[PDB]
Each structure stands twice: as structure tokens, then as C-alpha cells.
Design a protein around this nucleic acid. Structure first.
Ligand SMILES: [Zn+2]
Ligand SMILES: [Zn+2]
Ligand SMILES: [Zn+2]
Lengths: 167, 176, 157, 134, 54, 39, 66, 85, 309, 37
RNA sequence: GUUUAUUAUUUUUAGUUUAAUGUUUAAAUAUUUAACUAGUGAUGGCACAGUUGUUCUAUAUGUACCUAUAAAAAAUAGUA
RNA sequence: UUGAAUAUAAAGAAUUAUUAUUAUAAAUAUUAUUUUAAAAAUAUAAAAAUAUUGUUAAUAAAAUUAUCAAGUUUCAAAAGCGUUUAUUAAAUGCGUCGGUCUAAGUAUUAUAUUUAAGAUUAUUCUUGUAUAUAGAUUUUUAUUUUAAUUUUAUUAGUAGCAUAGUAAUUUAUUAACUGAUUAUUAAAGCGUUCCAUAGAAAAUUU
């Protein structure tokens, strides 16, 4: 009868049922229990298999104006893992074309809804109607040039690259 | 502590409490899923959710259509700080037909003062590289003049720059 | 708790508040600290009000932001503060004319309020009521006990 | 600046406006009138010190000669002033600061702070200059 | 350069007219540090013009 | 925030507890702000 | 806005004991408008309301001042 | 271990050029000009860590798969040489 | 529809009362019916959070907070339905904090304003019209003359023409009692106290609404108890003996003999009736022990009102 | 962590001792206007 | 950031239930660290003041010992 | 500036100190304050064979790691997830229940409390406060408050349970002042009891 039966939740994060609920299920192979745990994602996704460069036939999804090739971070390049369909790589948007098309304000929490090749705000694109945010109206909080999208998607061992141990 | 009603826009990060909880960042991405998923969460924002109660009475039906946003001109004319008896929308208008104009509340003007100081920041960085794309870009262009003028000089003066030995130690292509 | 990090202070510091100024206004006036003669209560704000609130007695929608929730419904109807009393002046409607004026003016303003109430109960419970609804309670068989409505139903109509 | 009104400062005002303990006051109608002497000594005998700084108008040509004007000369008065007193007829923009008068410690030791003034960088059309022969 | 909150060293501020040296203003000793308030306003502050609605 | 220190008397008898009821000395020269009003 | 005696215009430079608490809070605090820019007093040398040029007229939207 | 606007390279970084590590400027051979490189991943260390073998940090599971493509399956060209001169 | 009221039960204990027909929140906040105000918390004159002085009926319950939320749904309620002009139940709105149901009635001369919603009412039906009978239709607002003995009525008005005050809470009903008085009708208020209501008073026929509130509404969620936010109600026996006479005691002291909130609330002592109306016949104390039915049997006259109280 | 030890708190404790102007404004006879007699 | 079918719910979590150092110390509470962390119900518009406010109650706090500060006394101290 | 007026660099911990003051806004400036030739302690630990708790009141919630930084399992005791100046069977909180209230708020309601949800049940009996009361006291127990000393029935019981103790038995350990089990007269637990029980504190195994 160790007495202080109500406690601090002292030992969470030191468990094996935890070690399986801390992983991330990203787009890699990394069978499981081998992905990173605390930050949830490995830094520096190496992509030597496919070079992951910005294309030349690139254009804004929302606006459609051609986008500067790579000399700049004026474009928000969302590579949705392996995308292919939006462009050779994923959706492309100049930082100022990254607003909801239908309601015309920012995409709150940056989750957008590609409505027929014009990014729509999830809430409007979902039917809801509350149509003005508080902080910054016509410009999202997003990072530029995939720098905010590299928390997820295609870490180094995409696919079964067993070429490494085989003869 | 600098009551939030003083800040032009209410602050982004909102510190709370909780002696037994230590984390600066407010947990967004949870305040987002609720609200997007549940319609009721956010008060109807009277107009877009009035205009029923005025269609039902005058038409005998549920409106059964998407309500127009941007409240009609003439609604909420006695209200002064609507901002809640609405969405964060502006006070709609007078009961006029003049082109819509934002009533320049102290808030709207501040947003103008952001979207100019956003264009200001993205402009001081966009060209700090544009000139960093000359300094290092032209330093290399000049450095190769150096290795050329060193390349020319190191042939007449014959300094092979490959050790005390003659090239006969090189031709082996060993270490030596 | 044995660690007071004291860094959670220092964020968003308070205004300076220069309390010597109110300390001065006391002396630069006859009054002491306003001893509990008031001591206070939290005064209302303009936001929490709802003008166009279908209460408010319809004269006060600005003066009623102040006044408690318990006292603004009762604030009384007074006037636009520029409306002058009904004045027994001689300006008769442009085309009402005499014969009608000579008759109507004979009736006094209880001799005409009375006529109006009868006519209005007659206008309602007439084309207005007999056209669809019914406005007088019916008996066993369903016969309209009273001739015309009761004076209350008309009042709230 | 101390906002609180002092009693004496009104009394010292009267004794020079009209001989206070001895000469009875002028009727309040005259005092509300532009014919009251300090409003009459002003509308006809102004008292201003629009001093010119020369360090900006010396041998180096300038389109923006700088002045100092008393703190209570607004812009459009500095126009009226140079126009009707110094014949200056080309002033498109005036640019006005306000400077805390110079301070220092005299050899004795009291901090003897000069009065404050108002830099007003006028901008003439055709530049002006001053020659200094040595 | 711009109208921003900043920290200046005191010698940088330049001293009053000393017996040893004239009044050395913060500008005439550091010319390229004089703030350019045209360049501030043009870039950083919101002009009456851009929001003039009536 | 404030305090009268006297404690609000009944709305009918507006004054109980004058400071004299306690044999108090309040000369203008003794504690300064003294001299009472019922006087 | 100090004003000239003759000028019918009314300014808020009062010196009544009931009004000096706010006339200092203009000279030392300054106003932080809810639009983000600090008003009447924004820097070091606090203004001298009694050495202002007199209030010449109310502002208009179209021009500056009527 | 460094890429490009469109290409790659490889290089072991010292301590002295730790500044240029994240994003370097270099002659991109799939072009003829200097172009900004990035740091797609690590490929070891520039020296030993105390008390540790030659490959203390180890290049990667990743930068190896980049190597196993460059050297890797050269079976297209053991012709013209294998390792000789 | 099954059971126009449901114990929806999101979590096995958390049972909130959803009603099919309930208007979605969008069709709730109506502009010229929405009142907002700060409620004083429990602060009364001089801040000073405090109840009411013993003798008064103006409540500032000490334990009250967040009475008006500020962006909570708050539409005002009619309480004065008009006598026999047909209604038209447009929708049925359900506010959690004001537990009442209330549905918007068109009322047939344009007045899209009427709320109190009697039990078994359906939306999009006309209500205030009588059938062949006197006025015996659910929802019909009936003068107390038109009711017969033994049938429930809700939102009875205490003084005729002064708005419905009695029996407004959900599922409640004042039962008529067939009194003998000349021009008065006694109603068995739900508090088991009978009251000589004037017969010309107006009541809305039927039960009140939203049955299954009496029980079956249980939050048990920290977020969901913000339908009723109130201050903490501390033990009176852990209150710094300098402060509250029940205090200290090195362990669990049971409590003092005579309980007291701050002044006194001894268990059945403090009964705070101080003025009884001329209409009151038997207070809840005079009936508290008999039954519900035995009070429905007798005929009530002025001689039944006990000359001493 | 108080705030404002600076000079404005060094004047506002010295200039406010200046005694404002006193004018014995005696009570206004609102309800009994004397000049309408 | 994230686990789960779930808008509830596991939880990235760099300022806070632990431990070391520090012990007139860089600190009249800081460095490193364990823990915890999801607040549509709250560091915060102004509001309550000293026989008293406030108290999810610990006789806790109401400006860096709540014995509030500040102010005015000649309280008593020969009864080791 | 084309606005009249107005004013634009600097804090707080006693300091030029621990110290990004996070209101905002993004994202490669080759922006620029840290003495020095040793071993003791000590702050501290890179490195490294065996051993795995024999250390100790007690190992295991105890910095970072590219060698990518995570112990598993059983049993007993233990509620809510909020909240606290020596931080918890502290005090909150939903429900039920008791009492109060139909001339300021809706008697399936809101005041005023006692408990604690969930699941089983909730026992025997009264001397005083309260209520009712009849000039008052004195008298007087439908419900409530507090009580039950042999209340002690249910129920768990050597338990945070006044000593008696390391309780006697059983296990467990080489060694059992541990802990768990059986029952069971427990110095005077006891129906708000008891069960169920998850991250806590113990006891094993590992
Ligand atoms: Zn674009
Ligand atoms: Zn949108
Ligand atoms: Zn390239």
C-alpha cells in the first residue's frame, strides 16, 4: 500500500506502448518504430533517387501566372508527397496567390481544398460560411518553397531500395 | 499585463496558466479541426444566419440555398462594434447603393499597415540575396582570374606546385 | 513548488498608470479618496449592449448602454426631446375640410378615442377577422357567445 | 510643462494688462474684442524672432534654408511672415521640427537651459546663398 | 536607417561642445548612419493616400 | 477600491458612530486632517 | 488643441483640476491608436500643449482641414 | 551530399567551411555557371572522433544509395576500364 | 419521428437532450430578439461578491459566474402569447443554458416572435385555432375560465395581463383544482402549493416542453458543464476557522449542529416566506407531506386558506 | 519589476505639488431660478 | 507536430510538480534537467481595500517576509 | 509628408548583470568582445573488459548521441483529469438527496448545503440544536441537523485504524520487521459502505 496513489503521470514517454504511438507513418518505407520520434520527422530528407527539383513548365495553381524557376522563395511549393498530377511535382503558388479562391481570405491553418484547379479554403470549400479571420486576412501564414512542407513526405528510403545490402 | 483590448489585433500567441503545464505555443491544429468540422461551434454570425427567419416568415419555406455573405446594406446600423454580431465582417454599409467601401475602423487601417510591412520585409530579403548574388557571384568570377593569372605565372616560373620531386614521381600514379 | 522560474513574468508589461495623478486630483479638489460613498461597481460597456433589441422602450438605444440590465427595460418613454406637446394649433389636414372638421371637432379627445376603439374592434373582427380566423369564444354548440372580441384581444392585436 | 494653473500667474497677468489694484478693469466686452490692447499690440506690432541659421545658407548654395521660429508659429504663418516682412514669395513646402532649447551648466553650476524653439526648414524654389570674402 | 527601436552606444551619440572638442553631432561623425525618413516612410508606414475613402 | 471606515449605517439613521463617540482627539495640529464637521 | 481666445473653436487643452489627469497622459504617455501607430506623443521630447500654435479648424475627410 | 538547381555533387565539409555547409555556391556542371547548391544529406566526417574507428559517424543508409548508383551498377562500362590505367 | 425528445447520450453518462426538429444553430441567433448584458456575477453594490441581505427577493447568488457568456445564444422570449390569433410553429430552437425549448411562431399577423413551446407540438402546424371544443387544443393559449378541472396548463400568468410567470420550466404544468370561489380558479402549481388565480388570467394549454429534463440530463464533462457555469462551492468545514465557524479540527470534522451559510441556513429552519399574497391559499409547507393527488381532490374556497400562517 | 522609475515619475512627484487655482463656485440654484422672479 | 473510426481522443512540446549546480550565487531564485503539457472558457478591458477585499480553503496571498504599506504616539521592558 | 498640430533609437531586475521584453513580420550579410604551458579536490565526465543491484532509506520518470536514447510482465492499493504556498484519498466539479423559495426570473427552477461519479447496496436507536408550539421560558423529536459509548446487521478487516506486534497462519526469499492470500471478536472501521480501477506508490519476475 504505497500511499500516494494519485500522482503526476510521472512515467509517460518512457513506455513501449508509447514508442509505437510516437511514430509518424510518413511516406517512407522505414518499416515502423524506425522513424524519428520526438520531432516526428527526420531533418534533411535525402532524395537522391529522384532529384526533387522545381520544374520549368511550372505555374501557380490559384493564379496560373508562370512562376520564377528557382532563384527565389516567392513561391509556396507544396509537393504533396509524390504529386505528379498538380504539376510534374506538387501544387505551386506565389506567396500572394495562396488565398482561398471562393472566400478570398487566407487559408486558415493552411489546409486547403483543391477545388477544380483553384485552391479553395477548406471551410468555404466545405460549405461552412464564417468568412473572415482575425489575424491576417489576405495572406496566409505559410512558409515558402516547401520549407514548411518538409515536415512530411518522402524521407530517404522511399520504396524497397534493397539495392543497398544486395551484392 | 497590457490588456488585450489595447493591441490593434488581439495577440497571436495567447499565454494561459497551468502551473503543471509548460509549453509556450497555443495548440492550434486542434482549434482548427473543431470549427471546420462542426458548423455550430462558431456563433452563426447573425446576418448570414439571419435572412432565414426572414425568408421562412415571408416565403413559408426553409431558405434551402446558400445565404449571401457580406450583409446587405442597411443591416446592423445601430450596432457600433459588431465584430461578433456578425463574423469579423465590417459594419455592412449605410442603406445605400454606393459602391462598397470598408469603413476604416482602427482595425482595417492596421491590416493595411501589415500588408505594407509584409511587402516591406519580403522586399528587404528578396534583394539581400540579389546583391549576395553579385558579391559571391562576382567573387568567383574574379577568383578565376586569380587562378588564371596564377595559372599563367606558374608555367614560366615552372613551379609545378606538386612537391619537391620531379614529375617522375607523378607519372607512376602511385603515392610515389 | 520549489522553482519559480520568474521568466513567465516580464511578458507584455502593464501600462505605467502614473497613480500620482489620481492621488493629486484628490487634493486638487475638496474630496478625499471617494470613501465607500461610491466605492464602485463595474460600469457597463458599449459592446455588450444590443441596440435594435426590441426592448429598450424604443426611445433609448444610446443612453441605455449605460444603466444596468435590471434597469434599461424600464427606462421610460419620454420624447425625442424636440417633440413639442400636441399643440391645439389650427392646421387642419390639407383636404379633410369642414363639414367633416365641423363634425369631428365637436367630438372631444375622449369622445374620439372612444369612437376609435369601437371602430378598430369593428375593423378587426370584420373583414380582417371574419376573412379567416375567429376572435370571440363560442359556446356548447359553437355559437359566438359575445358579439365582438373582448377588449384585451384587441389591445394586444 | 506644468498644466496646473497657478493663482499668482493670473494676478501677474492683470497688473500688466491693466493696472490691477489701482485701475479698474476694462469692460468684458472690450476684453473679448480684437481691440483689447494685447490683441491690438499683436495685430499691429507682432513680437516674433524668426532667426535664420547661416550654417546651411553660407557659401554652399541651398534650396532649403533653415530657420528658427518661436514654438507657436505654425507653418502657414511662417509663410505669411516671410511673405509680408521679408518679401520672400517662393515657399512651396515648410518642414517643421521642435527642439528642446539648448542646455548647459554655467561656470557657477546652475543648469541654464535656453528657451526652446522650432526648426522650420523652408524650401525655396530658386536656391539662395551668402558670400563671405576672406 | 529606418524608424525602428534600436540600441546606440553613447560615444556614438556624440558629446556636447567640450573644452577640448567642438560639439560633435552624431551625424557629422557618422554620415552614413543618418536615418533616411523618406526611405522609411516610402517603405514602412501607411500613407493617408492608400486608405482615403469618402 | 476605497473604505469609509465608519461602516454604512441604516438608510434611516444615516449617522451612527461619530468619531467623538470614542473619545478621539483630532486637533488640526495633532493629527492634521482632524477637525470634525458636526461642529 | 490649444485655441485662441477670440476663436469660437473649442479645444481640449483644459487645465481644470478634473482634466489635467488626462492632459498629462497625453504629454507623457501619448496615445497608442488601435491602428498600430503611436499618436500625439511617440518619442522623447514631450510636447508643450501651451506652446502649440492655435487650433485653426476641424479636420475634413476630403481635404485636410476645413 | 550537395545538389543544385537540377544536379548533384559530393564533398566532405571541414570545420572551417561550416558556414557554407547548408547552401553553397558552385559550378553546376549540368549547366555552365556557378549555381547555388544545397545539402541533401550527410556523407561522413572530415576527421576522426576520439577513440573511434575510421568511419565513426558512417556516411548514411541514404548517401550510400546515392553512391550505389554512381559507382554501383557500372556494368554498362567495365569496358574502357575497371580500375586499371 | 421517434420521441420528439431524446436523451442523446454522446458519452455513456453525458446525456444532453437533443430533439429531432431542433433548428440548427444557424437558424437561432435572431437580430431583433437577441439581448446581451454582463450579469454582475455575484457582485452587488460595491462589487463585494455577496448574496442577498436576508429579507429580499432580488437574487445575486454568491456562487454565480459567467451568467451571460458573450457569444452564447441568447434570444429573448415572449411570455405573452396573444389570445386566439392562429400561430404557425416555424422552427423549434433549443438553447442549452436556458434549458427551455422555444419555437418561433408566426402568429398570423406578422409577428415572427413567440417562443414557449408546449409538449407534443410539431413544427409547421397551426396551433392557436380551436377545434369544435371550447379551446382544448395543445398550444392554444386559454383564459383560465375556459379550462375544466384536471387538465394541465403551462406559463400561467400570475396577474391577468401581466405576462406568464408560473410553470415556465420544461415539462412543468399547473393543474386546475376546481375551486368554489366566485370569480377565481385555484391551480395546483408544481410546488404543491395552491393559488387562487384570477379566472381571466391567460395560460397556455398543455404541458410545458422538453420532458426528460427532470432527470436524464447529466453532463459529466469539463467542457460541457459550461451550460451551467457557477463559482466553486467550497466546503463550509474547511474555511479557516477565523472565517467560518465550521472549520479546522484535525481531520474530518462532521460539522456544527446548526448549519449556516454565513448567517444561517439550518436545514429546515430558514424558511424565508415573509409576505404571503392575498391569492395564496396553502404554501408549499402546508402541503409538503400530503401527496400530489389528495390536493387534487378537495374543492378550494376562502375558508380553506388558514387564517394564521 | 515595478515600472517607470524615470524622469516622468521624478517630475510628476514635484510639479503636482503646485497648488491649482481655487474659485469658490457657490452652489447653483437650479430648481429655484432667481432671475425668473 | 501527432496516435485513433471519432469534431471526443494519444500526444511535438525549449521557459513552470523532480534532481544536480548555485548557497552574500550571474538571481534576496538563476543555470542544467525530470515531469507535465490540448485551456469555447482565460497571465489580461475596469471592478472590489484593511475586523477587511479575494480565496477550486493552504490561516493562503491583496507591490519584492501579511505582522499590509505609510503616517502618530515617548504603551509596557526591574521584576535575572 | 504634401496633413495642422504633434512626437520619432536608449527598460527592467541596485549594474553595461541570468536576460532573444515575441506586438508583429519572414528566412544563405563569410553583421562580430572573452585572458593563459601542469597534478588536488570540485563542476564534471569522453573512453572502456567482467559483474547486474551485494550499493542504498530506496537501482530503473531522470541531458545530449546519427551507435537516431523507448524496458516488458503479474498482483495488491487507488479517483478523475481540473486545482492549490510546504502539493496530496487537500479543496473543485456532474448526478442523486436535503432544505428554501410562487409579488423579481422559470419549484423537472434558481438560491443553501451535505456528499461524491460508475456499479451493489445503503442496517439498529435516540436525551440535545432545529421545526411545530398554546403570553416564554420549561415542556415536545414525520422529514432535516447532530448523535448511537453494546448502534454494528451488510460489507471489507492489522487497514494512512489509539497499544498490543514484525498480528497467527500460508506462500515468496539462501535469510520475509517486506508484500500478497485464507479467516475475522477490528483497544472504539462500518453502510457512504463495498466493489470494480489507469498513466502513482509499493511488492514480486525479468
Ligand atoms: Zn501564384
Ligand atoms: Zn474561402
Ligand atoms: Zn544544375
Amino acid at each position: 500500500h504505497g500511499k500516494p496513489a494519485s500522482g503526476h503521470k510521472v512515467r509517460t514517454q518512457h513506455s513501449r506502448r508509447w514508442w509505437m504511438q510516437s511514430k509518424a507513418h510518413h511516406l517512407t518505407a522505414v518499416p515502423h518504430e524506425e522513424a524519428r520520434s520526438r520531432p516526428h520527422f527526420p531533418a534533411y530528407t535525402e532524395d537522391v533517387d529522384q532529384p526533387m527539383v522545381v520544374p520549368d513548365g511550372v505555374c501557380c495553381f490559384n493564379c496560373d501566372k508562370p512562376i520564377d524557376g528557382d532563384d527565389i522563395n516567392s513561391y509556396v511549393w507544396v509537393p504533396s508527397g509524390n504529386a505528379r498530377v498538380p504539376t510534374t511535382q506538387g501544387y505551386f503558388f506565389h506567396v500572394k496567390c495562396f488565398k482561398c479562391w471562393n472566400c478570398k481570405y487566407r487559408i486558415i491553418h493552411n489546409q486547403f481544398y483543391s477545388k477544380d484547379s483553384r485552391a479553395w479554403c477548406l471551410s468555404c470549400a466545405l460549405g461552412r460560411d464564417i468568412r473572415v479571420p482575425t489575424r491576417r486576412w489576405h495572406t496566409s501564414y505559410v512558409n515558402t518553397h516547401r520549407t514548411g512542407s518538409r515536415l512530411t513526405g518522402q524521407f530517404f528510403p522511399r520504396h524497397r531500395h534493397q539495392m543497398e545490402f544486395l551484392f | 499585463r497590457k490588456a488585450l483590448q489595447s493591441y490593434p489585433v488581439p495577440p497571436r500567441a495567447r499565454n494561459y496558466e497551468r502551473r503543471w503545464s509548460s509549453s509556450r505555443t497555443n495548440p492550434y491544429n486542434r482549434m482548427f479541426w473543431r470549427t471546420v468540422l462542426n458548423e455550430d461551434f462558431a456563433r452563426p454570425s447573425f446576418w448570414v444566419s439571419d435572412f432565414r427567419h426572414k425568408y421562412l416568415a415571408k416565403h413559408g419555406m426553409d431558405y434551402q440555398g446558400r445565404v449571401p455573405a457580406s450583409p446587405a446594406p442597411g443591416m446592423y446600423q445601430g450596432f457600433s462594434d459588431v465584430h461578433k454580431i456578425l463574423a469579423n465582417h465590417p459594419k455592412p454599409q449605410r442603406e445605400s447603393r454606393h459602391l462598397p467601401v470598408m469603413p476604416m475602423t482602427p482595425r482595417v487601417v492596421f491590416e493595411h499597415a501589415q500588408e505594407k510591412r509584409i511587402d516591406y520585409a519580403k522586399k528587404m530579403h528578396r534583394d539581400r540575396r540579389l546583391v549576395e548574388q553579385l558579391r559571391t557571384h562576382e567573387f568567383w568570377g574574379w577568383y578565376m582570374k586569380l587562378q588564371r593569372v596564377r595559372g599563367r605565372w606558374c608555367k614560366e616560373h615552372g613551379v609545378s606546385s606538386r612537391g619537391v620531386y620531379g614529375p617522375a614521381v607523378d607519372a607512376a600514379e602511385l603515392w610515389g | 513548488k520549489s522553482q519559480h522560474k520568474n521568466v513567465l513574468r516580464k511578458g507584455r508589461p502593464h501600462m505605467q498608470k502614473y497613480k500620482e495623478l489620481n492621488r493629486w486630483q484628490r487634493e486638487a479638489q475638496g474630496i478625499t479618496k471617494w470613501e465607500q460613498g461610491h466605492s464602485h461597481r463595474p460600469q457597463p460597456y458599449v459592446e455588450r449592449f444590443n441596440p435594435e433589441g426590441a426592448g429598450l422602450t424604443r426611445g433609448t438605444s444610446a443612453y441605455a448602454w449605460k444603466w444596468w440590465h435590471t434597469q434599461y427595460p424600464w427606462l421610460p418613454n419620454v420624447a425625442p426631446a424636440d417633440y413639442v406637446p400636441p399643440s391645439p394649433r389650427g392646421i387642419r389636414p390639407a383636404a379633410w375640410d369642414d363639414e367633416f372638421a365641423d363634425v369631428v371637432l365637436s367630438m372631444s379627445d375622449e369622445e374620439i378615442q372612444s369612437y376609435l376603439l369601437d371602430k378598430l374592434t369593428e375593423v378587426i373582427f370584420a373583414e380582417t377577422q371574419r376573412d379567416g380566423y375567429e376572435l370571440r369564444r363560442l359556446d356548447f354548440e359553437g355559437k359566438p357567445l359575445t358579439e365582438l372580441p373582448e377588449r384585451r384581444i384587441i389591445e394586444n392585436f | 510643462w506644468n498644466p496646473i494653473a497657478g493663482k499668482i500667474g493670473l494676478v501677474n497677468r492683470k497688473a500688466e494688462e491693466w493696472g490691477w489694484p489701482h485701475q479698474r478693469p476694462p469692460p468684458t466686452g472690450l476684453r473679448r474684442s480684437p481691440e483689447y490692447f494685447p490683441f491690438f499690440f499683436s495685430r499691429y506690432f507682432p513680437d516674433v524672432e524668426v532667426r535664420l541659421v547661416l550654417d546651411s545658407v553660407l557659401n554652399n548654395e541651398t534650396t532649403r534654408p533653415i530657420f528658427h521660429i518661436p514654438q507657436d508659429m505654425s507653418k502657414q504663418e511662417l509663410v505669411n511672415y516671410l511673405k509680408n516682412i521679408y518679401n520672400i514669395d517662393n515657399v512651396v513646402r515648410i518642414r517643421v521640427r521642435n527642439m528642446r532649447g539648448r542646455r548647459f551648466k554655467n561656470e557657477v553650476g546652475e543648469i541654464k537651459s535656453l528657451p526652446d524653439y522650432k526648426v522650420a526648414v523652408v524650401e525655396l524654389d530658386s536656391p539662395v546663398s551668402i558670400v563671405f570674402k576672406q | 536607417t529606418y524608424s525602428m527601436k534600436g540600441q546606440r552606444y553613447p560615444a556614438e551619440q556624440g558629446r556636447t561642445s567640450r573644452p577640448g572638442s567642438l560639439a560633435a553631432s552624431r551625424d557629422r561623425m557618422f554620415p552614413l548612419y543618418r536615418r533616411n525618413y523618406k526611405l522609411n516612410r516610402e517603405l514602412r508606414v501607411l500613407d493617408h493616400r492608400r486608405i482615403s475613402t469618402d | 477600491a476605497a473604505t469609509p471606515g465608519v461602516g454604512i449605517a441604516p438608510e434611516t439613521t444615516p449617522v451612527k458612530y461619530v468619531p467623538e463617540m470614542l473619545n478621539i482627539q483630532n486637533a488640526k495640529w495633532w493629527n492634521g486632517r482632524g477637525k470634525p464637521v458636526y461642529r | 488643441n490649444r485655441t485662441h481666445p477670440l476663436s469660437k473653436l473649442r479645444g481640449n487643452l483644459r487645465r481644470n483640476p478634473s482634466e489635467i489627469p488626462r492632459v498629462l497622459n497625453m504629454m507623457i504617455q501619448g496615445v497608442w491608436h488601435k491602428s498600430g501607430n503611436k499618436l500625439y506623443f511617440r518619442g522623447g521630447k514631450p510636447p508643450n500643449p501651451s506652446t502649440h500654435p492655435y487650433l485653426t479648424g476641424e479636420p475634413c475627410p476630403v481635404y485636410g482641414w476645413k | 551530399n550537395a545538389c543544385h538547381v537540377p544536379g548533384d555533387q559530393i564533398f566532405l565539409v571541414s570545420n572551417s567551411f561550416t558556414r557554407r555547409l547548408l547552401t553553397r555556391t558552385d559550378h553546376c556542371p549540368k549547366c555552365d555557371r556557378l549555381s547555388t547548391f544545397r545539402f541533401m544529406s550527410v556523407s561522413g566526417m572530415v576527421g576522426r572522433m576520439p577513440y573511434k574507428p575510421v568511419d565513426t559517424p558512417g556516411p548514411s543508409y541514404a548517401t550510400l544509395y546515392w553512391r550505389k548508383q554512381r559507382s554501383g551498377k557500372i556494368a554498362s562500362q567495365p569496358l574502357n576500364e575497371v580500375c586499371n590505367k | 419521428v421517434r420521441s420528439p425528445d431524446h436523451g442523446y447520450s454522446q458519452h455513456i453518462l453525458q446525456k444532453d437532450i437533443w430533439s429531432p426538429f431542433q433548428v440548427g444553430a444557424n437558424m437561432m441567433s435572431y437580430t431583433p430578439l437577441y439581448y446581451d448584458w454582463k450579469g454582475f456575477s455575484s457582485r452587488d453594490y460595491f462589487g463585494h461578491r455577496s448574496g442577498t441581505n436576508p429579507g429580499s427577493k432580488v437574487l445575486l447568488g454568491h456562487y454565480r459566474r459567467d451568467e451571460v457568456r458573450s457569444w452564447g445564444y441568447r434570444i429573448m422570449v415572449n411570455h405573452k402569447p396573444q389570445k386566439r390569433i392562429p400561430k404557425w410553429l416555424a422552427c423549434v430552437v433549443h438553447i442549452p443554458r436556458k434549458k427551455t425549448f422555444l419555437g418561433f411562431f408566426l402568429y398570423a399577423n406578422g409577428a415572427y416572435v413567440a417562443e414557449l413551446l408546449t409538449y407534443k407540438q410539431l413544427p409547421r402546424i397551426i396551433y392557436n385555432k380551436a377545434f369544435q371544443g371550447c379551446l382544448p387544443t395543445i398550444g392554444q393559449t386559454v383564459s383560465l375560465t375556459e379550462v375544466t378541472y384536471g387538465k394541465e396548463i403551462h406559463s400561467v400568468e400570475m396577474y391577468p395581463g401581466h405576462g406568464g410567470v408560473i410553470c415556465r420550466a420544461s415539462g412543468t404544468a399547473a393543474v386546475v383544482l376546481r375551486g368554489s370561489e366566485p370569480n377565481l380558479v385555484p391551480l395546483l402549481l408544481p410546488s404543491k402549493e395552491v393559488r387562487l388565480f384570477d379566472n381571466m388570467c391567460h395560460a397556455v394549454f398543455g404541458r410545458r416542453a422538453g420532458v426528460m429534463y427532470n432527470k436524464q440530463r447529466n453532463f459529466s464533462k469539463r467542457s460541457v458543464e459550461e451550460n451551467m457555469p457557477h463559482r466553486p462551492k467550497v466546503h463550509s468545514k474547511t474555511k479557516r476557522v477565523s472565517s467560518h465557524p465550521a472549520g479546522g479540527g484535525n481531520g474530518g470534522s462532521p460539522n456544527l449542529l446548526t448549519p449556516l451559510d454565513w448567517r444561517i441556513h439550518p436545514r429546515n429552519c430558514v424558511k424565508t416566506k415573509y409576505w404571503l399574497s392575498g391569492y395564496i391559499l396553502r404554501g408549499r409547507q402546508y402541503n409538503r407531506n400530503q401527496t400530489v393527488a389528495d390536493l387534487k381532490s378537495k374543492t378550494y374556497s376562502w375558508a380553506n386558506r388558514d387564517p394564521v400562517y | 519589476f515595478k515600472q517607470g522609475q524615470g524622469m516622468f515619475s521624478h517630475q510628476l512627484k514635484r510639479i503636482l505639488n503646485k497648488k491649482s487655482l481655487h474659485k469658490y463656485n457657490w452652489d447653483p440654484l437650479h430648481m429655484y431660478d432667481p432671475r425668473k422672479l
